[model samples]
Target: HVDLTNCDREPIHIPGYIQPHGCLIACDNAMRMVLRHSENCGELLGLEGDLNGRTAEDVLGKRLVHDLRNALTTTRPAMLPAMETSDGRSFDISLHRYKSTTIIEFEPSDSDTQPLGTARKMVDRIREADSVESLISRTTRLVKATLGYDRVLIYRFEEDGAGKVVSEAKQPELESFLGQYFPASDIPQQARALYLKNTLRIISDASGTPIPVLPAVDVSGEPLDLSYAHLRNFSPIHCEYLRNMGVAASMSISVIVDDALWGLIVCHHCSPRVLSMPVRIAAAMFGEFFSMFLQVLKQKRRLDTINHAHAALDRFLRLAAHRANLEELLVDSFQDFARLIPCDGVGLWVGNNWHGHGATPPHDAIPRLARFVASVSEGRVWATHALSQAIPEAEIYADTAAGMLAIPISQVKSDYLLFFRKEIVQNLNWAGNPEKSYETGPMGDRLTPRKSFAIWKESVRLQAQPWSEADREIAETARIALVGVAFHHS
Candidate 1:
């Protein structure tokens, strides 16, 4: 009954609960004694009464405590290979320093035999992929096969922070979700930051009750920071979301490129499925490898765009050199100018005369549009999809010039180069209605996650296709080139 709207601000780190599958222990810097631990730690570790203030050497033995100390020397968390307990049970150990204390987590190492050979072959295949599409396709298939999940998806992040499932592999009976877009609000900023800190997240069973930590505070009387905790309880709102989608188990591996989170490799299972620590580690390593390849692919694409821009710049320069008058040159090369950038029309404002080609505003409106652009641009390149909204006069020309990209070529005069885009009515497909509902909940009247995800379709108007970084770069370069041409003529 938690209010879904303010859930993003929920103090998830101090949740005071851990998933029942794992045992967590917090100790001093030297790993000398236990400061706090989960209530079920005694049962999981086969240890007896009163673990508090007891040296880890006495609880886990001297050899293991020494290894934990060695692992904690680095700033980053370290995971030790599988080790056996004195009681003949195996557990994977992870050690890290958190908020002036040391945290060690133990999870049962019961799993199928590690598929190292298959994982190696999969990595090799991924390395040979030449394009982003091929890489994502191969990755989804390999992950679905290796993890034995019902579905696997490569969800890529867009500039606006929304996510789209670019590629997916699913069971033959399950519904496909490829190309579906989720709003940025779906994964709020706080959750995204946590993903960056913890590259791998897993929820074995969404409906399982969370086990509360004993005492729930460290020796300093502070709640233990579980920001990097593997057994951290899932957010209630998130749990409901997955349940609504008919997913019982889920895991996500963050794909980070150039120190920024780029996307995720998401796996969903219809039934509760527990993945071993080794399997999760292998998946995380694969995400790291894929991120590197993605970086290379993106760099290659950017280089290609720059080359295309340079070629177009060369054509414009040649046209300027052949024509004696600036206005005449732009008028003759309007089509070529439009080709330089992705736009439906091109316009030139020089010496109080406006010349344009293709779909443009009525000739009489050009002067008013130029003045508005100059005011908003502050003597620089300006672009907006809602030109009509920004300038009331532009509403009359919305059909022909709904979107505008203006580059001022002269500071002293109203000379400008403008790109016009005819209104493109689009039907946006969303996973759910992007709009949130504000309703009373157990917490209070707050925003809530949408209940339905029935392929919400929205008709959007007065907007053109968005301008890309490459498009803006080409337009800026063209502005500089035009300035040089005008100087030569004068």
Candidate 2:
């Protein structure tokens, strides 16, 4: 909406607005006077007038401001529960600093104002949750219980930016979205970037009115940086999307692994749900803990896989270390080669002699494949799960080498050590037509959310279980081993 034509080009970080549920006020670097205030702050704080140009001591009182400064130093960007004003009205106050400006957000508090050992227990449960799957499933249910959302999903972002609902916990009447695929267009690149920095986002009401921060821009023409604002307003495009999905209120807690966003604990509600600061704080804390646990668990599994691959690499080195000839290494240790990489086939091409152990491309096709790899792969250690897409001729050998990993043994000569995996066709049932994900709706010319979330069955072909970093590492080690045998033979 702000000079941006496409959905991906949205300027969400500095939207210059906040959701109606909270009020905001900011003070200058010296904290002696007010710089800006939200329009509704007068009503929310019972100030009866705008706080702009008002001395901090006179409007907010002196002792409390001192208390706030102390809290700012001691607290970890947290909330001060039930901080009462001189008029006796209380509010849940959040303090965070954006540049030299000290931002204070206030949410009116009722009589109800409400983790430590609870964290220890949550950590213990997360650690002992058996598999990553179980850990996330339990976490979603627990989060749902805490915040009382209608449906919760563990949405895993794929390599291509599209997300899939891997697991779900929902009200009985709601339709399941588990394994449902949504295109990258659903969450534009800008949205993804913002989530990483924000970590937690909540939309109390999808259709709720948003109030603007006064003075649209401070000294500069640029808008207020609401990157870390808990009550930051949503993009109009995003709001329309949620409404189409029949979600009245929504929350997303980013699950970060290794500092990168891995997924989200996405919660959706059929009715507007305003959460208390205590509940929101507890949930945010839990999300942080979950992210740490997820990182460790993912590393544990990844490390174990790499270690095993290295172990396999070590064994091959021993078995072929004293081999008399390259043929003997290839013929006798073919099974060992398969064990090292865990592929359906292993192929060796050195000069005129070409050896294909199990499932490999034809001898003539090997030349074409080798040339394609040399030209396109830039250097060495190239691979893909969908080879047919890269090399059209690969479609002929879809059953055998649809997924191929190649390690070029010699730079000058077209010699390679290739591993092959047969295609495994997958039938994917998507929530909507992913092909039409980026297109605008018929109602309007600009981008709009998909109207039909009905199942769209798609059959994916000419692919296999993709190779990973562990796979590439083992391939390199194997290449060195094969090079050793060739050197010894000559």
Candidate 3:
């Protein structure tokens, strides 16, 4: 055992004799021992003492006593490492088992292990980010660039099981799925729970077969010991879906905030990706760094949410200035509509007349929709399909689109705010088509007269009902903003 005492008087204790030793080697071997015991254990706490004769509990501090006990109970080892005891005196504990014996290592750490200058710099860097969105985007870009992924995106899930990829960073040649929405099916509740457990998923090959869970898992149901270099069976459905999308490899890092699954930063690769254990370890460190970064970001954002809300409110007023002609306002608020209704395109019609519009209607589908809406008399909006009778026709545009929201923009109890959106799909990247590389189908096909920007222009036209509290707040903001703008002209 070796102890490298730094200036702070805290010693980084590493178990096992150092052979051809250096700081890097000690760190690397320590990590290797961890991997051998449990594939999931990614962090390396300092280790010390001759653990060959001692059990993990003997050397570990109290904070990790329970975890150490639990890992030992299983026939196959588990990889949950923690520091025992909050006090600085206790040694670090890693509950890991090797071929013949359970390896227990000890390391002591305190606030001193980290250099004050470096920590202060990180704090300063974090303070510079003025808003939550900016901080999220900055951290997302850093994670993506640092890891060399083709794209990295921030996805925030809603309570009802829906989610949106709000911020995105991509290679120059790649297409952006920014502001896109996805369904709960993509990441089911069970899967979400798993994200909290694992924190990250690194898929070297989307097409590669999954390494199946051992048929008769250990009674403890501990995950397979994956220390050695070997492949396992992957979910065929997931593999096929990723293949269809053209993503050769993938990695996902969970963005946790307030102990909840706040969002994810997904890294994509167009070509096969194979990360060595060292690189993977580094990636894990990156996750830790990101977690710290995001903690700061969330704090800053919480402080700014009200300011952002006020800014949004002010923007709404600006939009309403041209309330009589909502074309520009709807176009201006395209991002908001995309987030709220979440669709390929959104159209708004007010008081029997389409008010503001954003996305361009599909080249081929718009004429048909025009005829369909023309057939309907005044005061009623005709979506691609009936809402109540049929599963909303809005679903027809894309497999991901669930339904549309048609609310009357009743200015003085007299109008409508019609909203339409498509659902989001998560597919692996495929070859040839970058946009559809993650999924199959006609990649560039537009849904209606709302081609991208054209659809957003239409959402400002009407305001309809069946509104939730959140929706009501957004709509009310829109209404008051427009009223104020109109009054300015008067």
Q: Which candidate leads the pack in TM-score?
A: 1
Candidates in order, TM-scores: namely: 0.85, 0.82, 0.43
Instruction: State the lDDT of candidate 3 residue by residue for 1-490, as single tens digits.
Output: 1121221222211111111101111111122222122211112334553322343344334445555555566223243322444334433232344333344433232223333344344435445665666777776677565567887877877655555667788887876667655555545464576566555566676654332221213345433332211122233344555566557777777767768887777887888775443344445555556676677766665445445655776766665654665545654564474444333446554334443354323345444443444345243433332222333343344333223444333334334344543322222221222324223432232221113223332321221122334444554555555444544543
Q: Sort by lDDT, best first: what order? A: 1, 2, 3
In model 1, the clashing pairs are none
Q: Count the backbone clashes (under 3 Å) in each candidate.
A: 0, 0, 87
Task: Give residue 237's error in model 1 in angstroms.
Answer: 1.0
C-alpha lDDT (0 to 100) for residue 424 of candidate 2: 46
| Per-candidate local distance difference test | 0.76, 0.73, 0.45
Point to the candidate with the largest lDDT.
1
Candidate 2 accuracy as TM-score: 0.82
- For model 1, where is the 10-residue window of minimal lDDT? 451-460
- Pick the winner on TM-score between candidates 1 and 3: 1
| Model 1 local distance difference test score | 0.76
Model 1 misplacement above 4 A: 111-119, 324-326, 344-366, 393-402, 409-413, 420-469
**Mind giving the per-residue lDDT tens digits that candidate 2 earns over 43-161?**
77677766788888877788678878787662235678779876677888888877667888888875263334344555666767656777888987876765679999998886666
